[PDB]
Design a protein around this ligand. Sequence first.
Ligand SMILES: O=P(O)(O)OC[C@H]1O[C@@H](O)[C@H](O)[C@@H](O)[C@@H]1O
Ligand SMILES: O=P(O)(O)OC[C@H]1O[C@@H](O)[C@H](O)[C@@H](O)[C@@H]1O
Lengths: 474, 474
Amino acid sequence: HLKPFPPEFLWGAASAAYQVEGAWNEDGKGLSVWDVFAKQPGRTFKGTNGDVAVDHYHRYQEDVALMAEMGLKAYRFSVSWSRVFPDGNGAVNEKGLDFYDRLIEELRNHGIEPIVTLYHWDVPQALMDAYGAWESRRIIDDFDRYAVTLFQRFGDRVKYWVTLNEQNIFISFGYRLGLHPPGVKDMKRMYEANHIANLANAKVIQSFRHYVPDGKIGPSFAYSPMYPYDSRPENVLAFENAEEFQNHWWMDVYAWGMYPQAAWNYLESQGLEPTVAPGDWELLQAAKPDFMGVNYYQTTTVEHNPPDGVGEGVMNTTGKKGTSTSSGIPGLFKTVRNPHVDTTNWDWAIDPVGLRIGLRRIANRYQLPILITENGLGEFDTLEPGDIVNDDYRIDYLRRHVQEIQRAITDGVDVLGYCAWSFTDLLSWLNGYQKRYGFVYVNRDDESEKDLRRIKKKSFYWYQRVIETNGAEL
Amino acid sequence: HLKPFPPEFLWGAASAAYQVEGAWNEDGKGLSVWDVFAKQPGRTFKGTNGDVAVDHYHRYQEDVALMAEMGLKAYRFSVSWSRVFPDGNGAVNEKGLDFYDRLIEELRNHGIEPIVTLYHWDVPQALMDAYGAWESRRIIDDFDRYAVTLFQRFGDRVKYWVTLNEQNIFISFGYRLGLHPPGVKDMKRMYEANHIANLANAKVIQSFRHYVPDGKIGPSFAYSPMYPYDSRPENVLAFENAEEFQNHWWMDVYAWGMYPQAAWNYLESQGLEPTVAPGDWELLQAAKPDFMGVNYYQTTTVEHNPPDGVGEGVMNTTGKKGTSTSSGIPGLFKTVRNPHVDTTNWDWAIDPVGLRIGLRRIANRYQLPILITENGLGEFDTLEPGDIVNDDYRIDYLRRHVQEIQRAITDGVDVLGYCAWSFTDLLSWLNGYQKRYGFVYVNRDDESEKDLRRIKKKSFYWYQRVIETNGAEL
Ligand SMILES: O=P(O)(O)OC[C@H]1O[C@@H](O)[C@H](O)[C@@H](O)[C@@H]1O
Ligand SMILES: O=P(O)(O)OC[C@H]1O[C@@H](O)[C@H](O)[C@@H](O)[C@@H]1O
């Protein structure tokens, strides 16, 4: 017998500024590292970039009207740092703030709760130019100043805040895999910037307690819960290393203010552990969040990896299912295909029970409320005659995940809300447009920009009914 | 490259008073619940009991000399509460305290560190008669009077103390399985008694901070780390249930003063959650231990268990391999044979890497030092002419477990010592005498005490060499 979703459950949907806004140089916006990075030849699929994206900066009023039509309780979006401080640390651009003000007013005027994400990977290029951005402690006070500006300006209107979105992703992709700005492949630098990002997160949660005392705030972690392949003890030990190295490495710092000891020691033995200054541990431990943001898409199964074994694998860019290969850390663990779940054609696991497992792990380990900030299925959509997009695949994925959430709530996990990814189709950081996540189809592809018109998918109406029946009808 | 065992590592061996002492009615000792229980027909194998056991009460000088010959750094034993308070809570039996004084003096005169266990399952029968022993809050103050009696008498000479030894066993075997005193099969009563023992534990740790400010104290948990059968999400979820219900239910209280939420809610949904009094959480949270004691023998593998599925299983007390059957909680998990490890003739898994995994989990979850208070292999031994016992099976098991401890120390786990179970052969609570654990064979069986003579097994000389080289030579 399932509990119902609490009466004030935030049924949400989410975006990210670069992925959606466009207007990349209007009204005084400065350059971000993704403005520069995406125009480098060969970085992004068919040269796609966010100059226009889906042009939400100009079309937000139509976008919010579709949200109100849908009945969204909440909308999560990111603020573009380079719209607010074109220099990162110089004068504030009032036109930048004014757009987010207009967006929030538009949201409230329709009874939609705004959830403001502070950082979704778009640090101003000037700060990377001036001092290497996340590799310098100077970004801590610059990021604080930016966050305080938003707190003072929108705190009276925004209850829910997310600090850093998927810090493990932009640190990892940006400094170990070289796939994101700044395009670095250097684990020593990766963990230095990661540590500085941890301090930046902690500093702004501290500021938030001062400036928005009645608000709620937390980082959002890209969480892939680890599984052992089988009950072979070597495989279970590999799972212990993987969950601590991939997940606790970040979530223990968010929740407890301290890195896990075994992973630290392994980094120390390699000379990779971050530099620590007086006052770091005090700050990190004094910044408890109200919730743990969670972006979930899939679980990961691991097995034993000998000292000689797998390192970086082969990411699935194409869509040709089967093209991924095992990624690992020699001596600790390597990934392996989970024979008991389906995958998308991008080799992503379809594992809604894994969401319940991950929600249970966070509550069991930290006793924190959880806001699901991102969950969704990316797939090709066909526009059929009569403005019909039949994305039954997308409905099937979201339904099962929402079902497992309800089971998590019945187990006792405190789930504050759920933000499907995404509201409209949007620009993928690297893979262009044809892998869509939206409830609302946007009329463009990789070659033709067309007119960017919004078309309601079948999933739009499925999710309209979910919100109307507070989850009772799925 | 492995770290060495720390220079003050407590290389130990262990026993329990009922299992070893004998002299059940000598020198003013009162009856314990096990004196009474084991003499009820059908409770124990071939009617074996602790009347004589291996007569360590009279023979402790011989036994300590053998410890000294082996070069033991520490000896862990339990104090028989009914020797000290014959009626549990009245006047002290000075002769009872005097035995443990002579024992501790004998150990210190041979340079062996005593590790005193306060409770190893033998509450005096008179407290069971007066108010039902662990089922009544009365026991909190009675157990405290007894602990403080020991603290004041021996605190000057004993630095390392264990409170409750395997609370999860004597509570669940006593109140859920009906296999230990008081022979109850009632889940509601089991969790009430469990909660009272949590309070008794916290109360004496609190008293210890006053009476033995320089000592170190912890409970000792019977830890079987759980494994999922495979990466099937339903099986990983049964692992999450199993680890929380069987392990976190006790260790979270010991480390954090808090029961885990999902397990609590499942018990509440069944009317099984314990009665909580004002001030309980305050006491439980303000009694941090210096270490987590760990009794390890095996891991447990689990799979999905439907709500009509498995409950109590068949236990193996004979010695014929393949007799045990699955046990579980319907709707949460059930155990299953781990196909990737061997088992003993009693169906206990042999999983030395599981010890590393369990030690890693405790450090990762609680950041506590660990004292391994029990680990050993129980098997039939053959006494060969010339008083020779070749127990290579025991050496092999101890060697691989001690090896995995060093890998755990290298990972960063703070392991304070290792107490092999047991120093001499002793009486098994239910299994009689033939399932032997000792380094020192004791000449007796289930039918005759014979001359109870002590015979060093081959593993005696192996462990002697382990200690002499501080574990460099295994
Ligand atoms: O590469 P894909 O399939 O388009 O997935 C990208 C999505 O994956 C998530 O990790 C990001 O938070 C999103 O911003 C992004 O939309
Ligand atoms: O294997 P057996 O004979 O059932 O014994 C298990 C042993 O290990 C633990 O369960 C107890 O702490 C010991 O007292 C006991 O002797």
